[PDB]
Structures are given as C-alpha cells and as structure tokens.
C-alpha cells in the first residue's frame, strides 16, 4: 500500500505471538519496541535519540510480521515511548520513500 | 525522486540562507534542526523522543527548501543530534511511503 503522511504511518505488527501497533519510521536505523516478552537470548545494548539515551535488549533473528509482510531481523526492546519499525526491517518489506 | 531505505534518507535543505543536510523522517511529527541562527521571533517549547526531552525554539512560517521543494512551516531548533524533516513539512512536498 501507499500511504500519505497527514497522519502517523502506523501499522499492525505481530511478533512473539502478540499484536501491536508500530510507526513506520524512516528516521530510525533500527527497530525499537516497548517492553514486551520475547523468547530467547538477548544482548545488552544502548542506543540514542533526541533526548538522550536508553538501555535496550537486542534480539537477533526475530520473526516479525509488519502489515502482513514477514521479516526476520534484529529487534531492540527497551523504554521507547512508541514502537518504531526502523530501516533494518523496512528494507526487508520493500518500503520506499517518494518525494 | 523515489528512495529505497538501505541508507539513511538524507537530503539537502536550505533555510535562512544556509545549506544543511537533513533526514526525511516519517517517524517525526515535527521538524527539528540542530542549533543554527534564524531571523525573527520564536516561542519556547519542549518536545520528546526516545531518550527523554529537549528544550527547543519554535519558529513559525519559516521558509525552507527541501531537496529542491519549497515549503513554509514550523521549524523547531534545539539540541537534536541530527537535523530531522518531520511530517509537517513532508506533506507539503508531497512525500509518500510505499510498503
Ligand atoms: C539506531 O537505532 C535507532 C532507532 C531509533 C532512534 S529515534 O527514535 O530516536 N529516532 C531517530 C531520529 C534521528 C531522532 C527516530 C524518529 O523517528 C523519532 C521516533 C519517535 C517518535 C515518538 C516518540 C519517540 C521517538 N521521532 C522523534 O523523536 O520525534 C519527536 C520530536 C519530533 O516531532 C514529534 O514526533 C515525535 C516526537 C515529537 C517531537 C534512534 C536510533
């Protein structure tokens, strides 16, 4: 689908058996989700945004469905104020920007 | 132009007579630029991102050229780590997202 930007580009995602809403975010290199339960082993990592930094947990090779499209990749979990789908997953579902 | 997302979607902007690079950011409601000199009166405002909050200066009806396209709108200036073009300006240049 094509989406204009008069509203936030929110989509439905499915990850770890659960349904959530997330923001398609061309401004984000990586994917960052609010606190949630994931299966498996993770790695401690710190990332930075507009107001400073947060500690996240890094999960690799995680299956995630984004607006119907399946992708496997790294997902960071930590105290972000919103679920963000970043470029590491956007390239996998073939998202482009038109200006 | 259409742009894929294997790299950051950076474009050239011109604002207040100066040339800068900025990120086309569908995840940002508003436009936030690093500290720079602008002409005119502004308003004190605070905005929030992944690691917390920052104080910005809000400039209205500012002329800004984004990748060749002229737009007039609100620009926030403050200690963001990167120049961000948000949805308030992206709609004006007709940017869309395709997934
Ligand atoms: C390497 O991996 C990553 C992944 C993500 C991030 S990030 O989240 O910091 N970011 C990067 C951006 C260059 C600042 C993406 C934006 O799209 C955020 C995403 C985000 C949205 C909402 C809340 C928190 C984060 N936009 C936002 O800060 O905008 C505010 C300010 C700009 O306009 C408005 O829209 C959202 C708020 C608000 C004021 C950093 C590193």
Residue numbers in the entry:
A (entry chain A), B (entry chain A): 1 to 99
Direct quotes from the study:
We have been focusing on the design and synthesis of non-peptidyl PIs that are active against HIV-1 variants highly resistant to the currently approved PIs. In the present work, we designed, synthesized, and identified two novel PIs, GRL-09510 and -09610, which contain a unique polycyclic crown-THF (Crwn-THF) as the P2 moiety and a sulfonamide isostere. GRL-09510, which contains a newly-generated polycyclic non-peptide P2-crown-tetrahydrofuranylurethane (Crwn-THF) and a sulfonamide isostere, potently suppressed the replication of wild-type HIV-1 and HIV-2 with favorable EC50 values.
The structural analysis using the X-ray crystallographic data of PR complexed with GRL-09510 showed that the P2-Crwn-THF of GRL-09510 forms a strong hydrogen-bond network with the backbone atoms of Asp 29 and Asp 30. In addition, as illustrated in Fig. 3c, the Crwn-THF forms greater VdW and hydrophobic contacts with multiple amino acids in the active site of PR than the bis-THF moiety of DRV. The two strong CH–O bonds between the Crwn-THF and the backbone carbonyl oxygen atom of G48 with the interatomic distances of 2.4 Å and 2.6 Å should also be responsible for the observed potent activity of GRL-09510 against HIV-1WT and various drug-resistant HIV-1 variants. The Cβ, Cγ and Cδ atoms of Ile47 (located in the highly flexible flap domain of the protease) are engaged in multiple Van der Waals interactions with the P2-Crwn-THF moiety of GRL-09510. The P2-mono-THF (of APV) or P2-bis-THF (of DRV) due to smaller size compared to P2-Crwn-THF may not retain their contacts with Val47 generated by the I47V substitution. Thus, the P2-Crwn-THF moiety of GRL-09510 perhaps not only contributes to the enthalpic component of binding via H-bonds with Asp29 and Asp30 (as seen with DRV) but also contributes to the entropic component via Van der Waals interactions with Ile47 as well as Val47 (I47V) due to its increased size. Thr91 is located in the helical domain of the protease, adjacent to Trp6′, and is engaged in multiple polar contacts with Asn88, Arg87 (directly) and Asp29 (indirectly). The T91A substitution may induce structural distortion in the helix generating a conformational “ripple effect” that may destabilize the H-bonds between P2-Crwn-THF moiety of GRL-09510 and the backbone of Asp29.
